[PDB]
Design a protein around this nucleic acid. Sequence first.
RNA 1: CGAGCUGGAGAUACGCUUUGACUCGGGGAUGUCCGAAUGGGGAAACCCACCUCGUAAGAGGUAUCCGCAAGGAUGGGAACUCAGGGAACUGAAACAUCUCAGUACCUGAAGGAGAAGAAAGAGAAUUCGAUUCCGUUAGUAGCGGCGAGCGAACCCGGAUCAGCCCAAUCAAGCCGAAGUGGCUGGAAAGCUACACCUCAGAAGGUGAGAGUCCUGUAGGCGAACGAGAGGUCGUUGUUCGUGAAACGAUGACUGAAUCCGCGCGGACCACCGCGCAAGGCUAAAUACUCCCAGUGACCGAUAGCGCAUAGUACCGUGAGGG
RNA 2: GUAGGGGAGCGUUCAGUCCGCGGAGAAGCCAUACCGGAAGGAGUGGUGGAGCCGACUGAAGUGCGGAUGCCGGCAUGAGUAACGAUAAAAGAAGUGAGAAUCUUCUUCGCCGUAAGGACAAGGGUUCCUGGGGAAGGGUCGUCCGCCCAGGGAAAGUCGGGACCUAAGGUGAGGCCGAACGGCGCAGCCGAUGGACAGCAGGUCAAGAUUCCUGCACCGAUCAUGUGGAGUGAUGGAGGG
Lengths: 66, 72, 110, 93
Amino acid sequence: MKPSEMRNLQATDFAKEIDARKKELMELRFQAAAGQLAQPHRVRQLRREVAQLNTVKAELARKGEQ
Amino acid sequence: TGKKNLVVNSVIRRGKARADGGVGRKTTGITKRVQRANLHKKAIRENGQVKTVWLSANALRTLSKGPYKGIE
Amino acid sequence: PSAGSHHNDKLHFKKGDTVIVLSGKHKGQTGKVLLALPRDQKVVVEGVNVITKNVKPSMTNPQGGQEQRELALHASKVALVDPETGKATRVRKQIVDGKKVRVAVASGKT
Amino acid sequence: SHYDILQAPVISEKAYSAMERGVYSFWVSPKATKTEIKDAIQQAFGVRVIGISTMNVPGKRKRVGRFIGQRNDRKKAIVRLAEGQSIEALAGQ
RNA sequence: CGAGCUGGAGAUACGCUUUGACUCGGGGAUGUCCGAAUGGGGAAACCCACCUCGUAAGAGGUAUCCGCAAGGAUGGGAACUCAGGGAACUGAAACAUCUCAGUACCUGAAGGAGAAGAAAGAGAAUUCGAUUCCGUUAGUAGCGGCGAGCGAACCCGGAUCAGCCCAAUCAAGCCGAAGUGGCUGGAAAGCUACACCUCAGAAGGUGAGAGUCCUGUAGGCGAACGAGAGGUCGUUGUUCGUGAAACGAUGACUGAAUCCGCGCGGACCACCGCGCAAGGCUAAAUACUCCCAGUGACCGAUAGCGCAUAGUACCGUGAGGG
RNA sequence: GUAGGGGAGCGUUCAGUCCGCGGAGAAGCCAUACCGGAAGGAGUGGUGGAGCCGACUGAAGUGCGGAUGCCGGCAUGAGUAACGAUAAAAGAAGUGAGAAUCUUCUUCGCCGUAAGGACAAGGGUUCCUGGGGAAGGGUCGUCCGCCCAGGGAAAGUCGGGACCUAAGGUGAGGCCGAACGGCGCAGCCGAUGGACAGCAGGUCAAGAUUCCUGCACCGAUCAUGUGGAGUGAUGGAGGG
Ligand SMILES: [Mg+2]
Ligand SMILES: [Mg+2]
Ligand SMILES: [Mg+2]
Ligand SMILES: [Mg+2]
């Protein structure tokens, strides 16, 4: 979600943990359209996770490569 | 526009009557005060490699003597 | 239009504090603070009580009678009390927690 | 990527009656193409698309408040699959 | 910063937060497509490509002008700056030189300023000592169909103050003194009785009018790490309108001297005096106000900006108008 | 006593000063038979609901009946002219708070080289369904092209593009020009033209040469065999 237990993971695991949220994030949209969206907060939260993910896989890209 | 030292620009053209005579005769009255433009010419000259360019006639002289940065 | 900036979106109480109501009706009456709206300058204390009507046709039964609920105030209640009445605040330091600064006056308890 | 593109499923009664024929309809990215859209469905749902027909759709409401109004702009994609039909179970909604 | 937050939003549902949300100050990271627009096309925001890396997704490149290359230029700025080009209505109680005016407008180049600048000078004391600006001289000197009208400079006082080079503290923010009872009132901050603070009685708020109720004010602290040549012809500039017209300036033709030398001193000569052009840079004083703060014998809803917000609605093919 | 000149003052906003007043009721508004020589000023009462009078002095965006003045509101004409083709309309039944006007049935009448039907341009959701009934509808609406919400639009073959060129536009190089710019070979852009593969049916409430059923066609990459050696440009010609 936010600490060093997130960045510690592999490169193809970062791409994997991005799309895992997106699969849910799309299912939430399909639920929203139907009228079974009792947890709207989950949508805001999942999108936040993808942001942090992409932010980090750009912090570690610049570090080492100088 | 002449290649060595740019040219073209010009000004006005007066035209008086009751002219000539007794020092200042009676006087000289103007009937013109209009507006004019004066110009120059072109010839083939090259420095560095190939170029034809516009050549100021009074700088065509300047070149027939000592090459003033450019050459024939 | 303006609104509660005349202060600094800054209050003198927390959503827990016991406060006495200085000025107006409900003068002197005390109560716990249950809602603090800093920008709006609102206080929901167990003080000023109101009888609000319910415009509720389709809204969960047409049985929308009268409701017992308390209506919010401003700075028309002097925050924090211990020598039985309203006071200012002056002496800060730390308790066991250094990071926190307490409040007190002619006495020393909040 | 895969999971984006398909914004939502087409609700309505005509799509729900199409559902019954193994014909699935979706609201997709307006910029998305037929090839790109076919790929995303084939992937995310794990089913072969035997045909894709698609078309763009406009907007324009307001109710009150002389607030001009505005379009909304979508794209609807409708797909047919071979005898091995069905999407998830998210068909019998 | 220290408890609330979930934009205006006057709106419910889901939630987030002392393992410190929110907000504020300072950095980063992402930044679709159009636009200088820049791969190519195009009726802006859309079509259509090629090349390199790649598991697809996806990423990078492909415009011309400068230069070896690093690196620079295109485009946008309210007004201000210099430059190229440059009106007429109007005044002259007609009009033609003249005036309006080198104003308005167009165009170019640029910056936070620019311009100008380091005496071939001003000038008449053998004084001065780069430039710009302000006062003044002075409506003087002068120019003028000597008409309408136009109009300097030197001296002096003042702002600022440099001459150099080449060619042979302020934003985030924290701390901050001191009033209680009765009365009138729906409501006290007013009235009344005694009281205190004052390096703070500026100001806003609070049911009405507030030093002592809140925010503050005087005063103090305060940040990891954040900014501060001569000539003839043609013409013209300045008070310069062919005048006795010098001097600068340059389109056409010509064309020198080199310090017992050259230019200037209002035709011109001699004498006396001032100065070294034909190479470049150069801060400050000056100007303007998109923006920011403070203030006002400025406005307070037909006022004040066009707008208590809208360049919207409406009008127009459009520029534009509103 | 007109133009005009001279004198003394009244009133408005703002300002500095002083005296005050005010939620036990300020300004403003309304009524009035009171005062002053006039501009004017006060008392009382009524409304209002939070600011304000008096005096001195200062400064002005300082006094309106006129401008075919400007902005706004409201009158007159007047319940008047009109209600937009002289192609008619009638009854029944229905719905509804309400019906000449909405629905349905049976008649009538008008168009029928159109007043029917299919594109294009242009418009933009006006389409279909369910609701509505302020305003728009020259009357009325229960209705509508109006208002609200939901839906509807489907292409290898039809138009356009990934093909072509005309006028014209642009245009490296190039030719000209105080600037801004003007021209211009190839090339490129540019349909109104050339080129090029699909027909017959079905049917949503609302799409159809697009979806669906039937049976076709076009090109591309690969595979399996036939086949056994050429393939044929940015240029030639024919042809379009
Ligand atoms: Mg008003
Ligand atoms: Mg505006
Ligand atoms: Mg009048
Ligand atoms: Mg051509």
